[PDB]
Amino acid sequence: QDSLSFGFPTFPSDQKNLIFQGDAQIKNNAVQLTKTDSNGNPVASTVGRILFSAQVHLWEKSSSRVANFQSQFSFSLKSPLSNGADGIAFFIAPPDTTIPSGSGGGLLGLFAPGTAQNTSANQVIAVEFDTFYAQDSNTWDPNYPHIGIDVNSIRSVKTVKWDRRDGQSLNVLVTFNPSTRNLDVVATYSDGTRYEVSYEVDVRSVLPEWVRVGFSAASGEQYQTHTLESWSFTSTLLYT
């Protein structure tokens, strides 16, 4: 299809079109990307991702068209302590993507250790909400919580300082305009606090014509829940 759209105002238990990977599962009408114990408490060493089953036609080489897309979602992070880790990310990747071996902790379940910073070895565009930046393990991170745009590397091509708020839902809008090639990210808390980050990227040189979209999250030794509360997505192939 030239156009595709879907909306999950909430996430009931009887899902049919979601691909669950790792520890991801539905709990209380929401998607819990990372594992939680009996009493809904976050645990260490866990990775989880979800992908929508239908493939998205991002660009078409024959017609020279590229899709414009918009992804709107909300999530909350909760942790018994304050150094919650590691973060959640919205990502776009080849249809057969799977959790890379040893991609836990700071790699957010998106990259493999040996190639995490090699752009020519990966095929992924992601918007990360990174809450852990200890320089001993996350050497590629700026020294503060941040939202970042990742293009084939865990080392973001662009970041903006962000504030982690335990238990508060963050509303996010990610938009890609094929006319300008700008990938824009706007995130807001209910009180109006806003964060913005954008980057120019030619999706045609990074990803295949057909892709899958979804979310990924992980917790290494430090932990927190990564709760995806709602998600809507729309894409339309356009002539630039």
Ligand X SMILES: CO[C@H]1O[C@H](CO)[C@@H](O)[C@H](O[C@H]2O[C@H](CO)[C@@H](O)[C@H](O)[C@@H]2O)[C@@H]1O
Q: Where along the sequence are the contacts to Ca ion (CB under 5 A)?
A: 106, 130, 132, 138, 141
> Is 136 among the residues that bind ligand X (CB under 6 A)?
yes
Q: Which of 19, 60, 113, 175 binds its own copies (CB under 8 A)?
A: 60
Binding mask 56-95 for ligand X (x = CB under 6 A): -----------------------------xx---------
138 labeled part of a ligand binding site: yes
User: How, if at all, do strands 210-219 and 46-52 pair?
Assistant: antiparallel
Residue with tokens 């209910």: 190
Helix (H) or strand (E) holding 74: strand 65-78
226 labeled part of a ligand binding site: no
Q: Which does 4 bind (CB under 5 to 8 A by kind): its own copies, Mn ion, Ca ion, none?
A: its own copies
Beta carbons within 8 Å of 1's beta carbon, 6+ residues apart:
57
128 labeled part of a ligand binding site: yes
SS3 content of the chain, % helix, strand, coil (to 5): 5, 45, 50
Angstrom distances, CA of residue 169 to CA of 57, 192, 228 = 30, 12, 9
> Is 141 among the residues that bind Mn ion (CB under 5 A)?
yes
Q: Which does 132 bind (CB under 5 to 8 A by kind): Mn ion, its own copies, Ca ion, none?
A: Ca ion
Token reading at 175: 């938009």
Q: Half-sphere exposure of 137 toward its Cβ, with a 13 Å CA cutoff?
A: 15
> Is 112 among the residues that bind ligand X (CB under 6 A)?
no
Q: Half-sphere exposure of 156 toward its Cβ, with a 13 Å CA cutoff?
A: 25
Q: For binding to ligand X (CB under 6 A), which residues are involved? A: 85-86, 104-106, 132, 134, 136-138, 219-222
Q: For binding to its own copies (CB under 8 A), which residues are involved? A: 1-10, 12, 14, 16-17, 53-55, 57, 60, 62, 95, 209-210, 232
